[PDB]
């Protein structure tokens, strides 16, 4: 138990594939421990994690997007060449300004406004499945799930048709760079893309200011800046395109990939949702609890504070193993039961809790639900193919990189006889 704390290393297959099992020892008997390989304190229980999320002044989100790689002089030089001035934009932003900015920018995330995006999501998903449904073997990640949430994010922002086509090359992987230990080479490749995207978005922001009464979050926020000029700076608005894409893209990809893996691995449940699609919203919620995209999330203390009887110093790094909380028998009855009927499944912590709780969570849920319904209606007869599941190593987000499935196209429901 002393040994497991000293040896704690999340940069390995077992933490990525099943973090809740990997730390079950700690959830059961060691609710806080220091991990000297990380210089992080690690918490694993549902109520400890809710307590930390509940106080954003004591427990700052300043380290949420902090890379574990050693810092890069070449990275800084590339970003300064492009005039990069990305702000800490909501997810890792401190009080008091975070809640003031969330108050003025949150309206377009309301369920009533996200409802306008539903036809576009349905069309993207139908068009993606059309491109592979007649083949009989496909990787659901590379052949649909990767791209759909990137395009959805650009629609939520209000990016115009020509600009979305020019943005295809910016749909890169950010998870290892922000939450893991990228090589010097990967760090520099991401920096170059980020700087180029900063330049591209400066130009999009001028155009959006010319059509400020048009649709989407960016134009909403430009109109809010006119009402609250001392709350919304120009560089914060410039930062909002990247912030939303990072927030909305791989999160949703990982959630959907995991949900499909779990539903196909639990064949009786796949059969149930193929028979009764009204079960899909609740099923997607239990997928988030049982096999969610968030392994871990982070905070840094701003004052000495007692957590589980241990007084942490100022500036202490905390890893909250959200997947462990989501498997915690002290909150979830029979947590190893994958139960799509679970009434409290939405009490999972993949969207956080409290002041920074995910603003886009209902759009993420809608995308998951539409992708599951399209595949259960048009490919009920598919099955997971034999394959190895590989996870990129990082502290926060987990999903297999590929998800191969196979089926008989002649038995597709849209071709099958009555
Ligand atoms: C399944 C998909 C998603 C997951 C798992 C997810 C997860 C998260 C998490 C863990 C946080 C931090 C919560 C906290 O500290 O309490 C967060 C914040 C946020 N997410 Fe999401 N997210 C998802 C989808 C999206 C989408 C689709 C958007 C945009 C439309 C989005 C926008 C945001 C924003 C703007 C924040 C910052 C809120 C704040 O700090 O006040 N997310 N998300």
Author numbering: 28 to 445
The paper states:
Notably, CYP116B46 from T. thermophilus is a highly potent and thermostable protein.
In particular, helix αB’, αE, αF, and αG in CYP116B5-N and CYP116B46-N adopt various conformations.
